Amino acid sequence: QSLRSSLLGLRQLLRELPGDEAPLDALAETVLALLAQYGSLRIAGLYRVRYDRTPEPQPLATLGEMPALDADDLLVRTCLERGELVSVRQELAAVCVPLVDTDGRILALLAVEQMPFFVFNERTFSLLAILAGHIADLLQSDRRALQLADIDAQRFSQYLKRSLLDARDHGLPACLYAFELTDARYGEEVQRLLEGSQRGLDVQLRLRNDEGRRVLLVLLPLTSAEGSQGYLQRLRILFAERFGQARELESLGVRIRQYELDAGNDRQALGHFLFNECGLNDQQVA
Numbered sequence: 001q002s003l004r005s006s007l008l009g010l011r012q013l014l015r016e017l018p019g020d021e022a023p024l025d026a027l028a029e030t031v032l033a034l035l036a037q038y039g040s041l042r043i044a045g046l047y048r049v050r051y052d053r054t055p056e057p058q059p060l061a062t063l064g065e066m067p068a069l070d071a072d073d074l075l076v077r078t079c080l081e082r083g084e085l086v087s088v089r090q091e092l093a094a095v096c097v098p099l100v101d102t103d104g105r106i107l108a109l110l111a112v113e114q115m116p117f118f119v120f121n122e123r124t125f126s127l128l129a130i131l132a133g134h135i136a137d138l139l140q141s142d143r144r145a146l147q148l149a150d151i152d153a154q155r156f157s158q159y160l161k162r163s164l165l166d167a168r169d170h171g172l173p174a175c176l177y178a179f180e181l182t183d184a185r186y187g188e189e190v191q192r193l194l195e196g197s198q199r200g201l202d203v204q205l206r207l208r209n210d211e212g213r214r215v216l217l218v219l220l221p222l223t224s225a226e227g228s229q230g231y232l233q234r235l236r237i238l239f240a241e242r243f244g245q246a247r248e249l250e251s252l253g254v255r256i257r258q259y260e261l262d263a264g265n266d267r268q269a270l271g272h273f274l275f276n277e278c279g280l281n282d283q284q285v286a
């Protein structure tokens with residue numbers, strides 16, 4: 001999908017930002033255009049939402065002839081109280097979509113007054129809420145350089161939690177691969193090759209399991225089983241280049257463990273997979 005790409009588009013617009021103002025302010029037009037592109041919206045506004053869940057009166061960006069927030073509008077009110085997307089009774093201030101990061105913090109409000117009736121359904125609402133959540137996360141970029149954990153640990157943890165929320169609420173797929181490197185002669189060069197393979201939005205952790213062996217953990221957000229397979233196919237081609245074509249990944253001591261995130265999975269399953277299947281612990285992944 002252009003979902004991954006649009007998010008990658010936005011993230012790398014953010015990564016080029018001066019770094020001296022505020023992402024919500026600088027990117028509000030593009031954020032709204034994104035939300036509009038996906039919801040086929042005609043009249044809408046993007047609004048900052050302050051720490052105590054009250055909306056900032058003046059819109060960050062407009063789309064079409066768009067009137068102001070009148071008061072504690074029922075739809076705006078329930079949106080920010082429930083922290084969920086709220087829309088009016090179909091049988092008709094059309095939709096209110098909050099942008100909420102993985103910590104539950106509301107960063108913004110998409111307030112819609114007009115969108116084609118034929119798209120005013122659960123399918124489009126879902127896509128709006130998905131996009132809102134991911135955009136909220138990418139704007140989060142701050143207060144992290146006041147945490148002891150490395151930037152890679154922080155990112156991995158947020159992306160993983162977003163992936164679990166996406167599986168739980170929207171049935172969106174993601175995959176984890178743990179590469180355990182069992183042969184010390186090849187381990188470092190294999191890990192370097194895996195680190196260099198990282199592509200858009202996948203996030204990695206460089207770890208050591210309980211048995212002292214290198215483990216390179218890779219999360220693939222928004223990635224189906226098709227596709228996790230495309231990833232491994234790509235990776236084997238890269239290994240063939242780096243090491244023998246005459247040779248396979250497993251002959252370098254690579255053991256692969258894979259976990260597919262599924263809302264249907266038991267609640268303890270991801271923890272079972274990482275801790276004691278992969279031999280990792282809660283100080284490494286949280």
Ligand SMILES: Nc1nc2c(ncn2[C@@H]2O[C@@H]3COP(=O)(O)O[C@H]4[C@@H](O)[C@H](n5cnc6c(=O)[nH]c(N)nc65)O[C@@H]4COP(=O)(O)O[C@H]3[C@H]2O)c(=O)[nH]1
Nearest residue numbers: 001197198199200202220221223226227228229230231234
């Ligand atoms: N999460 C994740 N999934 C992966 C990865 N590598 C492969 N896949 C999955 O396998 C499919 C085939 O990838 P490909 O053969 O590299 O074929 C790719 C590749 O030729 C090109 N492409 C996509 N993204 C990039 C990129 O960031 N850089 C470059 N150079 N090419 C890309 O577009 C083709 C289609 O890509 P997709 O539709 O995304 O479909 C991809 C994707 O679903 C990965 O590192 N992470």
